[PDB]
Amino acid sequence: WXAXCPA
Amino acid sequence: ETTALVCDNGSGLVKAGFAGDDAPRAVFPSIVGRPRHQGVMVGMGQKDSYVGDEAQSKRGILTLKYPIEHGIITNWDDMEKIWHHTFYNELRVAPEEHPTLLTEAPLNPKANREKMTQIMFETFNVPAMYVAIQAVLSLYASGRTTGIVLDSGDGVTHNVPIYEGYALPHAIMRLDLAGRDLTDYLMKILTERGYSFVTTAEREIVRDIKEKLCYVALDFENEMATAASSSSLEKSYELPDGQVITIGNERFRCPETLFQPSFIGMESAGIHETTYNSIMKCDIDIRKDLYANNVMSGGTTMYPGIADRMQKEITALAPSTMKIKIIAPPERKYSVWIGGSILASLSTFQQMWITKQEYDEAGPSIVHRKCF
Amino acid sequence: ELYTKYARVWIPDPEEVWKSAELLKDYKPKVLQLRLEEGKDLEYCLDPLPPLRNPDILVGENDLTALSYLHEPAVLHNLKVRFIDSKLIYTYCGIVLVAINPYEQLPIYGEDIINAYSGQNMGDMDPHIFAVAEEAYKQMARDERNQSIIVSGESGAGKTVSAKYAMRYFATVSGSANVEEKVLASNPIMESIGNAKTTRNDNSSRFGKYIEIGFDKRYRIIGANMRTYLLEKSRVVFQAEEERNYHIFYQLCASAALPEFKTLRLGNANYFHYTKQGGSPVIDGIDDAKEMVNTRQACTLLGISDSYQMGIFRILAGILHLGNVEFASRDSDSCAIPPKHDPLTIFCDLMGVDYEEMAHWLCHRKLATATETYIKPISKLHAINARDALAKHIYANLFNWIVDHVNKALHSTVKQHSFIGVLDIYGFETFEINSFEQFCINYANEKLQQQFNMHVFKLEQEEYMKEQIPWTLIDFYDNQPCINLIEAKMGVLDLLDEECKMPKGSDDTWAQKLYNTHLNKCALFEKPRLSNKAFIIKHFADKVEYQCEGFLEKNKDTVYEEQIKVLKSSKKFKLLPELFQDSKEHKKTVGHQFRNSLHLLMETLNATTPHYVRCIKPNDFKFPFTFDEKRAVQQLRACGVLETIRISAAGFPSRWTYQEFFSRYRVLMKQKDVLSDRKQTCKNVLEKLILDKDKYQFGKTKIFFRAGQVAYLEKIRADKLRAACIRIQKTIRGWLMRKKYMRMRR
Amino acid sequence: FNKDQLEEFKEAFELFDRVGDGKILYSQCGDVMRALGQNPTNAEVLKVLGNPKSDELKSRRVDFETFLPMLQAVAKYEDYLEGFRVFDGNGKVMGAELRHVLTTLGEKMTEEEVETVLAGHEDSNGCINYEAFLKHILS
Ligand SMILES: Nc1ncnc2c1ncn2[C@@H]1O[C@H](COP(=O)(O)OP(=O)(O)O)[C@@H](O)[C@H]1O
Ligand SMILES: Nc1ncnc2c1ncn2[C@@H]1O[C@H](COP(=O)(O)OP(=O)(O)O)[C@@H](O)[C@H]1O
Ligand SMILES: [Mg+2]
Ligand SMILES: [Mg+2]
């Protein structure tokens, strides 16, 4: 992703 | 007429084919490999990168990257190689000539659709494109207009309530446990028996172990006491080199994390209680029709006994006189593709495509305007 | 404007579509006083003029376009007087031959008359079907281009008997050492497999039969080739009230007592689900047990061996027994055939297949991706749809196989130089209830009349090029907007095939899609005022109301490949593997298979030159040689004759050769004015008689007239002839008066 | 009419008085007019008679003085030729066709009148020279 997770 | 292409960018596999086909013509792991060793032999014929089954075959020599994780495309240069390989090598079809129906998981970043469109119109010059929610296609695939679709991939899990053909976008749950976090947990629990799987190529032995030998317990504590008390559940498998490894109570313990994400230290509730909490966000007139028509979808729902564990543990939550039914067709691994194949062949759909004229006029933002 | 005392006009009537009326007082530019039959009282209310009637010398002419006033009364009257009074059954309109079922036998078809027509041009003779066959045989010499005779009409109109005589003509004039015996002996087979009792009549043909008669380089007959199109596959499994399916099934059931057929374990004609449905197993006055024997004899004459005949009847008994396979549901999403199920046991015995393999494959379907393969249970509804689609697929392949063995006997080894082809196709249909079968029949008739209207438009453009006349004067009716409504994408068929594969599609949601897509977007599609489950199409002939109930059941074919591969595994007898020897075709719906078959027919016909025969049925009761106005007008609208006539009335209907114009109107033209050539004589005289040229044109070979001018010339001609009779009679009568008067003075 | 005409016509009229009252019938008026060189149609005769009804036409009798204005009114070549030329262009007319049209069209005559006037004028083909026949019938 961009925040709460690695992607 | 020219058929549309129908293409599904799973996290784990690409499924692709032509609309109106009953099953996908190309399925291969959406994986990109690069060589990680000194090139000793002159004149062998080097290659900068392998894709799909080529990267599976060589995988002892390669570092394997997945370019999608959690349904987000995390580097585009690999994903564009995967699409290039899909159109030109696996389907052997000119993308100049066919509409392309793509697919996406709900509630994911907006930029993913902008880029995923821009690359289709600039790079592949496709005539017309669409992007469709995964869980919507599983209803076309299962002959229904009403249901709550539980869909679980390699990278993402989501619930989407649909009643009489209307989606209920406030009730959509997304949950981020999937086959890859089952696999990474399975490596950690396999370490308890001394087997250690470390590298990216060696992870994908564990993925095949998970596929062959895992199953979901119908009472986690009773089968725990049994396999702690008996060899009867203990089963054994050959690694590629012929080493035998033996796997016991642990083989149910990894898919149990779908129902107890606290094993991974995840916050949320499991897929059952997120399903019930999704139905509790729907209007009370429709819950009786969402307690039937629980549709399983995607590969992470292929475990033996998962439908029974779902039906049991929703039946512990729902009121005692609602008829709980779980619907799990044996082809549910492909159901998102089958539903894309149906959707792309309807004549009422042929107005829905984003034509290149419209992308030229509007720019890629149009994909949000002309689409769910 | 002509209306006077002692004029005649036609008036409408609910009993007979027009009444003759005598005009009793001259018209003044507002209500008309009329005498009638049955004494006289009328005053007749004009609306914000009555149709006007041809002088009695015209009525009964050989050619409906030779009338001076053209309208539905004049046409109906000419056909009525020619049929009832003169016992003439053949008539022309434009190029179109029009044929009326005398419906008792006649001398007219004798070989003397066949020889009398040979070599004659089409205007040299009174009309007859041999005049059309002869024009075909001429055009095939004048150009190598092949010729088609298109016979069309309602069921029972006489299309088959008209084809019979059309072929008898070619075989008498051309033919030599034989086709005739084999072709006529094929009819009981194609009638047995391909004809059914419809609601309105017995023995309706549900397919388009096309016979190619082949000729050599010297136009001797070589041989014949039979094609078939537009087979009504859906009748095999679904039947309306007091319909039947194809006769063969009932001839078979009626033969159950014969010792050959004991093994087939047949029952009575209402024991089977594919023959019980209509509630009317016996036709009045047909003994299916004897049509059986005439069928087997027709097979034997064409050299289908008794081994293959028993194969055919074994496969049909197979289909009949298949229809009785009953599925029990075990879940909303799964069904099974019950244990030891007798109909399936007998079916698998007949077909020689493992009972438990058919029992499995009937209830399951199979999918494979490239690597790996899956078996799905299916609902009881999808099992019943699949079984019906298998029965339809067997029947259609059996029909194509019988047609191929008939062709084996009809083909001949000499290389066919050219052919004349004869087509027996059902006409435009309208019934108190109309269903998907009628929607197909009417779409095929839209295509055929598009071809017809283009052919007529070409022919009269070419006549105007013979006559150096402007094309802009002529126009034609365009029915492409209705074809686009039926056939194009987002059309009525396309939204039907979509609704076959949308989940939980239904006739009720299909109808809603129709209304959403066309209701006020298209002028030719209309919703019936008091229903949501029907729609109206504005065809060329009439508005037709179609009922959505049970389109989708009729629309749907999908045959699961594993069931064909089970039948193809059969080892018991020769025929069943041979049927299926050479996909997307298994998916295609009945509507798409019909669209494609019709495109094959139109590719066959557009490569050819047509000549048309229209058949009309005088009466529904089979009364010999009597005529009903009310049916006949419906037929003549369904045949497009009335539109063609109206369109001609808009143009220049009446065309006189100058020498015939003189031969008629010498009384009009003075002994002084006539010239050393009659063409210039008439070119002057007509300008004397009619002040404005716009009423007429002068061609190279004919005078062309607008409608009505001939009746005017005949009126003034007859009044002048009576003035001449007044002169001559007055002179002779006055002489006799003088003679007797002066005798008295003497 | 002059005195000479009136005397000849009155004498002829009196020969036709079949009742002795010095009168003829209305129905004889046309016959007298035709005998005096006029060629009126039956319609013209009825018009000058005043379109009488059957009873007075058959039994009412009029003397010369009432007849005279009608005779006067009735009294007051190329058309005759063209009228015969309708049925011609060699100058002939079929006897059968002339008989049919004269006995079936217009003011139909009897077959005997036509036979009487046509006797001796048709040849072996059955053709009448109408210019000669016309001169004969106009005298
Ligand atoms: N038969 C099976 N049993 C258990 N897990 C499976 C099975 N087949 C696939 N998986 C797992 O599910 C994931 C692939 O599912 P898939 O539906 O292909 O994902 P996506 O649709 O996102 O590509 C992988 O983690 C794979 O290991
Ligand atoms: N020209 C004809 N002369 C005599 N009888 C005729 C003629 N045309 C039709 N019929 C009678 O009408 C019947 C019905 O017409 P037919 O052509 O057999 O049915 P269809 O037109 O549906 O093929 C014929 O079997 C025959 O008895
Ligand atoms: Mg998926
Ligand atoms: Mg027939």
Cβ-Cβ contacts under 8 Å for D69 (sequence gap 6 or more): none
Tell how strand C609-616 and strand C18-23 pair up: unpaired
At C555 the three-state DSSP class reads: helix
Token pair, residue D50, equals 């005043």
Strand partners, B102: B131
Residues D79-91 as b or e (16 or more Cβ within 10 Å = b): ebebbbbbbeeee
Q: How far is residue C265's CA from residue C404's CA, in Å, rounded to a whole number? A: 29
DSSP state letters, B289-308 = HHHS-EEEESGGG-STTHHH
Strand partners, B243: none
Sequence-ordered strand ranges (E) for C437-542: 525-526, 534-538
Q: How far is residue C6's CA from residue C532's CA, in Å, rounded to a whole number? A: 53
In ligand 1, which atom is closest to the CA atom of B11? 22
Q: How far is residue C133's CA from residue C397's CA, in Å, rounded to a whole number? A: 33
Q: Pick from C99, C102, C94: which is nearest to C64 by CA?
A: C94
Cα angle C692-C697-C703, degrees, rounded to a multiple of 5: 120
**Dihedral angle computed from the Cα positions of residues B224, B209, C366 and C344, in that order, rounded to the nearest 10 degrees:** -50
Q: Residues 638-667, chain C: which have Cβ within 8 Å of D?
A: 667
Q: How far is residue B101's CA from residue C83's CA, in Å, rounded to a whole number? A: 65
Tell how strand B147-152 and strand B294-297 pair up: parallel
Which amino acid is residue C580, in one-letter code? F
H/E run at residue B26:
strand B26-29
Residue C153 labelled as part of a binding site: yes
Place of tokens 């009269």: C460
Token pair, residue B95, equals 């993308």
Q: How far is residue C592's CA from residue B244's CA, in Å, rounded to a whole number? A: 57
Q: What's the CATH number for B183-271?
A: 3.90.640.10
Q: Is C498 close to B329, i.e. CB distance below 8 A?
A: no
* Partner-chain residue, chosen from C370, C489, C501, that has the shortest CB–CB distance to B27: C370
Which amino acid is residue C317, in one-letter code? A
- DSSP letter at D122 equals B
DSSP state letters, C15-53 = SSSEEEEEE-S-----EEEEE-SSS---EEE------B-
Token pair, residue B149, equals 């679709």
Q: How far is residue C408's CA from residue C400's CA, in Å, rounded to a whole number? A: 12
H/E run at residue B327:
strand B326-327
Evaluate the CA torsion angle C203, C204, C209, C215 in order and state its sign: positive
Token pair, residue C109, equals 């078809």
HSE (side-chain half, CA atoms, 13 Å) at B237: 18
Ligand 2 atom 5, closest CA: C103
Tell how strand C702-705 and strand C696-698 pair up: antiparallel
Tell how strand B235-238 and strand B244-247 pair up: antiparallel
Instruction: Give the residue range(s) of CATH 3.30.420.40 domains in chain B.
Output: 2-28+70-135+335-368, 136-182+272-334
C245: left (phi over 0), alpha (psi -120 to 50) or beta: beta
User: Could you tell me if B349 and B343 are in contact, meaning their C-beta atoms sit under 8 angstroms apart?
Assistant: yes
Q: Between A and B, how many residue pairs show a Cβ–Cβ distance under 8 A?
A: 12
Place of tokens 């007749």: C44
User: CB burial class (10 A; 0-12, 13-18, 19+) of residue C501?
Assistant: middle
HSE (side-chain half, CA atoms, 13 Å) at C595: 19
User: Could you tell me if C506 and C463 are in contact, meaning their C-beta atoms sit under 8 angstroms apart?
Assistant: no
**Does ligand 1 lie within 6 Å of residue B154's CB atom?**
yes
In ligand 1, which atom is closest to the CA atom of B14? 23
* Cα C577 from chain centre: 37
H/E run at residue B101:
strand B100-104
User: Could you tell me if C75 and C30 are in contact, meaning their C-beta atoms sit under 8 angstroms apart?
Assistant: no
User: Could you tell me if B134 and B336 are in contact, meaning their C-beta atoms sit under 8 angstroms apart?
Assistant: yes
Evaluate the CA torsion angle B266, B270, B271, B275 in order and state its sign: negative
Cα angle C638-C82-C202, degrees, rounded to a multiple of 5: 45
Token pair, residue C51, equals 């149709």
Tell how strand C147-153 and strand C609-616 pair up: parallel
For residue B8, the CA-to-ligand 1 centroid distance in Å is 14
Q: Is D109 close to C670, i.e. CB distance below 8 A?
A: no
Residues of D in contact with C732 (CB under 8 A): 102, 109, 113-114, 117, 137
In ligand 2, which atom is closest to the CA atom of C155? 22
Phi and psi angles of residue C547, each rounded to the nearest 5 degrees, phi first: -105, 125
Mutate to test the pocket of ligand 1, among B15, B154, B204, B301 (most ligand atoms within 8 A of CB): B154
For residue B153, the CA-to-ligand 1 centroid distance in Å is 6
Q: How many CB atoms lie within 10 A of CB C105?
A: 8
**Does ligand 1 lie within 6 Å of residue B249's CB atom?**
no
Ligand 2 atom 26, closest CA: C103
In ligand 2, which atom is closest to the CA atom of C105? 4
Count the helix, strand and coil residues of chain D and give each as a percent rounded to the nearest 5.
60, 10, 30
* Partner-chain residue, chosen from C367, C495, C504, that has the shortest CB–CB distance to B22: C367
DSSP state letters, B170-220 = GG-EEE---HHHHHHHHHHHHGGGT----SHHHHHHHHHHHHHH----SSH
Evaluate the CA torsion angle C111, C114, C115, C116 in order and state its sign: positive
Instruction: Give the residue range(s) of CATH 3.90.640.10 domains in chain B.
Output: 183-271
User: Could you tell me if B129 and B332 are in contact, meaning their C-beta atoms sit under 8 angstroms apart?
Assistant: no
User: Could you tell me if C700 and C711 are in contact, meaning their C-beta atoms sit under 8 angstroms apart?
Assistant: no
Q: Between B and C, how many residue pairs show a Cβ–Cβ distance under 8 A?
A: 47
Angle between helices C306-322 and C380-410 (to 10 degrees): 160
How far lies C680's CA from each of C685, C686, D87, in Å? Answer: 8, 10, 23
Q: How far is residue C355's CA from residue C349's CA, in Å, rounded to a whole number? A: 8
Phi and psi angles of residue C217, each rounded to the nearest 5 degrees, phi first: -60, -20
Phi and psi angles of residue C323, each rounded to the nearest 5 degrees, phi first: -60, -25
The architecture of the domain spanning B29-69 is Roll (2.30)
User: Could you tell me if C283 and C233 are in contact, meaning their C-beta atoms sit under 8 angstroms apart?
Assistant: no
Query: What is the longest distance spanned by two Cα atoms in chain C?
Result: 132
H/E run at residue C141:
helix C129-142
At C445 the three-state DSSP class reads: helix
Token pair, residue D8, equals 């000849």
C288: left (phi over 0), alpha (psi -120 to 50) or beta: alpha
Q: What's the CATH number for B2-28+70-135+335-368?
A: 3.30.420.40
Token pair, residue C390, equals 């298998």
Which amino acid is residue C242, in one-letter code? E
Evaluate the CA torsion angle C449, C451, C457, C460 in order and state its sign: negative
Angle between helices C709-745 and D78-85 (to 10 degrees): 110
- What Å resolution does this PDB entry report? 3.1
For residue C101, the CA-to-ligand 2 centroid distance in Å is 7
Q: Pick from C241, C208, C248: which is nearest to C226 by CA?
A: C208
Q: How far is residue C709's CA from residue C687's CA, in Å, rounded to a whole number? A: 13
For residue B308, the CA-to-ligand 1 centroid distance in Å is 19
Place of tokens 């009932």: C250
Q: What is the CA radius of gyration of chain D?
A: 18
Mutate to test the interface with B, among A1, A2, A5 (most CBs of B within 10 A): A1
Place of tokens 């032995």: B205
Q: Do chains A and B touch (3 or more CB pairs under 8 A)?
A: yes
Q: Does B176 touch chain A (CB under 8 A)?
A: yes
Query: What is the longest distance spanned by two Cα atoms in chain A?
Result: 9
User: Could you tell me if B269 and B261 are in contact, meaning their C-beta atoms sit under 8 angstroms apart?
Assistant: yes
User: CB burial class (10 A; 0-12, 13-18, 19+) of residue C1?
Assistant: exposed
Residue C155 labelled as part of a binding site: yes
H/E run at residue C170:
helix C159-173
Q: What's the CATH number for B136-182+272-334?
A: 3.30.420.40
Q: Pick from B192, B159, B201, B162: which is nearest to B177 by CA?
A: B159
Q: How far is residue B92's CA from residue B20's CA, in Å, rounded to a whole number? A: 17
Q: How far apart are the first and last CA of chain A?
A: 4
How many residues are recorded in chain A? Answer: 7
- DSSP letter at C371 equals S
Token pair, residue B164, equals 């009489």
Place of tokens 């609910």: C14
Q: Do chains C and D touch (3 or more CB pairs under 8 A)?
A: yes
Q: How far is residue C60's CA from residue C62's CA, in Å, rounded to a whole number? A: 7
Q: How far is residue C154's CA from residue C615's CA, in Å, rounded to a whole number? A: 7
Q: Pick from B226, B220, B225, B250: which is nearest to B236 by CA?
A: B250
Token pair, residue B321, equals 């006189």
Q: How far is residue C126's CA from residue C115's CA, in Å, rounded to a whole number? A: 14
Q: How far is residue D54's CA from residue D57's CA, in Å, rounded to a whole number? A: 5
Q: How far apart are the first and last CA of chain B?
A: 27
- DSSP letter at B266 equals -
Catalytic center residues of C: 155-156, 160, 201, 204-205, 427, 429
Residues with C-beta atoms within 5 A of ion ligand 4: C 160, 205
Strand partners, C512: none
Q: Do chains B and C touch (3 or more CB pairs under 8 A)?
A: yes
Q: Is C742 close to D35, i.e. CB distance below 8 A?
A: yes
Residues of B in contact with C513 (CB under 8 A): 348
Strand partners, D92: D129
How far lies C525's CA from each of C159, C478, C518, D44, in Å? Answer: 31, 16, 6, 67
Cα angle D18-D22-D23, degrees, rounded to a multiple of 5: 70
Q: How far apart are the first and last CA of chain D?
A: 20
Cβ-Cβ contacts under 8 Å for C399 (sequence gap 6 or more): C193, C194, C228, C231
Token pair, residue D35, equals 């005998």
Which amino acid is residue C96, in one-letter code? V
User: CB burial class (10 A; 0-12, 13-18, 19+) of residue B332?
Assistant: buried
User: Could you tell me if C285 and C310 are in contact, meaning their C-beta atoms sit under 8 angstroms apart?
Assistant: no
User: Could you tell me if C22 and C34 are in contact, meaning their C-beta atoms sit under 8 angstroms apart?
Assistant: yes
Q: How far is residue D97's CA from residue C691's CA, in Å, rounded to a whole number? A: 33
Q: Pick from B357, B263, B276, B352: which is nearest to B310 by CA?
A: B276
**Does ligand 2 lie within 6 Å of residue C127's CB atom?**
no
Q: How far is residue C620's CA from residue C599's CA, in Å, rounded to a whole number? A: 33
Q: How far is residue C514's CA from residue C506's CA, in Å, rounded to a whole number? A: 12
At C213 the three-state DSSP class reads: strand
Q: How many CB atoms lie within 10 A of CB B83?
A: 23
DSSP state letters, C256-274 = TTSGGGTTTT---TTSSHH
Strand partners, C98: C91, C614
**Does ligand 1 lie within 6 Å of residue B303's CB atom?**
yes
User: Could you tell me if C192 and C296 are in contact, meaning their C-beta atoms sit under 8 angstroms apart?
Assistant: no
- Residues of C contacting chain B (CB within 8 angstroms): 333, 367-371, 374-376, 489-490, 494-495, 497-498, 501-504, 513, 587
**Dihedral angle computed from the Cα positions of residues C576, C577, C582 and C583, in that order, rounded to the nearest 10 degrees:** 90
DSSP state letters, C560-608 = -HHHHHHHHT--S-SHHHHHH---HHHH--HHHHHHHHHHHHHHHHHTS
At C403 the three-state DSSP class reads: helix
Cβ-Cβ contacts under 8 Å for C224 (sequence gap 6 or more): C179, C182, C183, C211, C212, C213, C214, C410
Which amino acid is residue C45, in one-letter code? C
Q: How many CB atoms lie within 10 A of CB D121?
A: 16
Q: How far is residue B37's CA from residue C525's CA, in Å, rounded to a whole number? A: 71
Q: Does A6 touch chain B (CB under 8 A)?
A: yes
Place of tokens 């047609």: C403
DSSP state letters, B38-75 = ---STTS---S-EETHHHHHTTTSEEEE-SEETTEE--
**Does ligand 2 lie within 6 Å of residue C653's CB atom?**
no
Cα angle D87-D93-D95, degrees, rounded to a multiple of 5: 120
Q: Which ligand sits nearest to residue C87's alpha carbon?
A: 2
Please report which residue ranges of C174-287 form alpha helices under DSSP H.
179-194, 247-254, 273-276
Q: Is B346 close to C501, i.e. CB distance below 8 A?
A: yes
Token pair, residue C719, equals 């009044």
Q: How far is residue C461's CA from residue C469's CA, in Å, rounded to a whole number? A: 9
